[PDB]
Amino acid sequence: KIEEGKLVIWINGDKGYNGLAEVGKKFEKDTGIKVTVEHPDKLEEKFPQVAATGDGPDIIFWHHDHFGGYAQSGLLAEITPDKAFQDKLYPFTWDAVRYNGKLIAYPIAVMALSLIYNKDLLPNPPKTWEEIPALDKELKAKGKSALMFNLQEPEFTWPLIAADGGYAFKYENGKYDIKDVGVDNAGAKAGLTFLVDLIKNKHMNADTDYSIAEAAFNKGETAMTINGPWAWSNIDTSKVNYGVTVLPTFKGQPSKPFVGVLSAGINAASPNKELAKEFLENYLLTDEGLEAVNKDKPLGAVALKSYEEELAKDPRIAATMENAQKGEIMPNIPQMSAFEYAVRTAVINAASGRQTVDEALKDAQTRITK
């Protein structure tokens, strides 16, 4: 069993744990309650094992894409933030922490791909995908390419595919319809066709992966790339004069990247559910709380409006949130793994020529709906 009278928190060591501990001292100072933070290896794997025997931490911090499986095994307690507290965070973040209609976690930070460009090569990045082909011809006359990004993982191409209508699973009334998949509709085919055309016209090469794109970009060979916050440090050291901005639109509609939400859940077996709620709502999810974490280590875009507005003075963090607000929340249901294999394959086959956009997406849809 979990000891009553105190709080034990688990969070990955790459996050600001000393910060959370700092909020913990504040909490103890205030209430006299002890708060201890631990960061075990493979904690996201350990949690379901120890929580299943009625043990583990009171609170667990991790990307929401793992909370669906946790809730599915009843490993998380239903949280009870009232309407006023909920209105303190961007509305879209709450959709990432709902399990079959029930809120099962507090969103903390938001992640999503943005458009990264070389300010020297491109003082004014393109507002649309449509204008990239001609921009590439212009730049190639100077021995540079317009854009390069990972074409081997679905996360990087989906923003364009979803712009005109593609989606993973229909989400309405707080829930997903596992039977409504939009992988082979006109919107998706339009986006993939445009991606394929770029390749066909030699603006991009179907073989470009993550390593190749970063190399080209950090080396000043290509004017733009698509990647998340986790890639910035590597660019900082390349000394490239880079900027981060909203993704290009397609057919007048915003690209829609998948959004990841760092969340804090309460162990279903925790006898300290009330202390956890007090800690999370009134200590961590405040400007002072988040300020303590961020300082120890960067949080990036946060879900708390008031503090997000402060961090947003950094155009890169503001861009992450803009792209996230226009993005598609990453579904946490089990079928999402089928979508990721099916779509990775379709994109690679359409890109290589092994399949037409029509056939590749037709087979993916069928695969995901089975």
From Swiss-Prot:
Subcellular location field: Periplasm
Keywords from the named record: Periplasm, Signal, Sugar transport, Transport
Name of the protein described by the UniProt record: Maltose/maltodextrin-binding periplasmic protein
Natural source organism: Escherichia coli O157:H7
Gene Ontology MF, one: carbohydrate transmembrane transporter activity
UniProt function note: Part of the ABC transporter complex MalEFGK involved in maltose/maltodextrin import. Binds maltose and higher maltodextrins.
Signal recorded as keyword: yes
Predominant place of localization: periplasm
Similarity comment text for this entry: Belongs to the bacterial solute-binding protein 1 family.
UniProt-listed GO biological process terms: maltodextrin transmembrane transport; maltose transport
Superkingdom of origin: Bacteria
InterPro entries per record: Maltose/Cyclodextrin-bd, SBP, SBP_1_CS
Record-linked SUPFAM superfamilies: Periplasmic binding protein-like II (SSF53850)
UniProt gene name: malE
Assembly and interaction partners: The complex is composed of two ATP-binding proteins (MalK), two transmembrane proteins (MalG and MalF) and a solute-binding protein (MalE).
GO cellular component, one term: ATP-binding cassette (ABC) transporter complex, substrate-binding subunit-containing
PROSITE patterns, per database record: SBP_BACTERIAL_1
Keyword Transport: yes
NCBIfam families, per the entry: PRK09474.1 (NF007011)
